[PDB]
């Protein structure tokens, strides 16, 4: 792909983070803590899952960023509406305002309803995410495999401003402690 020139500098929004997440000083890395991180509760924080939003809001244009997922067993990545539900149980689906892929139990899937199997021969260490607001497109790329396409959501109905979306996953296994990192341009 040739989307690299739409690169945007994404930072994480502490106020949206689940209370167990640890966001780095530069707001470019996040990992699951082993305990509550001593923050107050608020209506923005994801309560049920280890999720956080980027600070940036997009309502037009073309945007590209990359995320490092090295040595994680489980994660969700993509974009979501600014107005997604924060509290309680929900599924990641376009009907609920999410355009995401994930890793879980050694398989990769797109967050359609129901979920779609992905075909990845080279497990990615970094994921590229491209959003074309006007076209209604969200695409995912395997940076480890020379930028190969993973999945395209098309005919997207964003229905509001979009925010970068992240889930570091639980760490019940002791094998999923590694961070998500926003990679440099
Ligand atoms: C299911 C659910 C609903 C609501 C809340 N949190 C609050 O309403 C809240 C707002 C301001 C200060 C505060 F401490 C809490 C957490 C939840 O998990």
Swiss-Prot record:
<protein>
    <recommendedName>
        <fullName>E3 ubiquitin-protein ligase TRIM21</fullName>
    </recommendedName>
</protein>
<comment type="similarity">
    <text>Belongs to the TRIM/RBCC family.</text>
</comment>
<feature type="domain" description="B30.2/SPRY">
    <location>
        <begin position="8"/>
        <end position="185"/>
    </location>
</feature>
<comment type="subunit">
    <text>Homotrimer. Component of a SCF(SKP2)-like complex containing CUL1, SKP1, TRIM21 and SKP2. Interacts with CALR, CUL1, FBXW11, HSPA5, IKBKB, IRF3, SKP1 and VCP. Interacts with SKP2; the interaction with SKP2 does not depend on an intact F-box domain. Interacts (via N-terminus and C-terminus) with DCP2 (via N-terminus and C-terminus). Interacts (via C-terminus) with IRF8 (via C-terminus). Interacts with ULK1, BECN1 and with ATG8 family members, including GABARAP, GABARAPL1, GABARAPL2 and MAP1LC3C/LC3C. Interacts with TRIM21 and SQSTM1/sequestosome 1. Interacts with IRF3.</text>
</comment>
<comment type="function">
    <text>E3 ubiquitin-protein ligase whose activity is dependent on E2 enzymes, UBE2D1, UBE2D2, UBE2E1 and UBE2E2. Forms a ubiquitin ligase complex in cooperation with the E2 UBE2D2 that is used not only for the ubiquitination of USP4 and IKBKB but also for its self-ubiquitination. Component of cullin-RING-based SCF (SKP1-CUL1-F-box protein) E3 ubiquitin-protein ligase complexes such as SCF(SKP2)-like complexes. A TRIM21-containing SCF(SKP2)-like complex is shown to mediate ubiquitination of CDKN1B ('Thr-187' phosphorylated-form), thereby promoting its degradation by the proteasome.</text>
</comment>
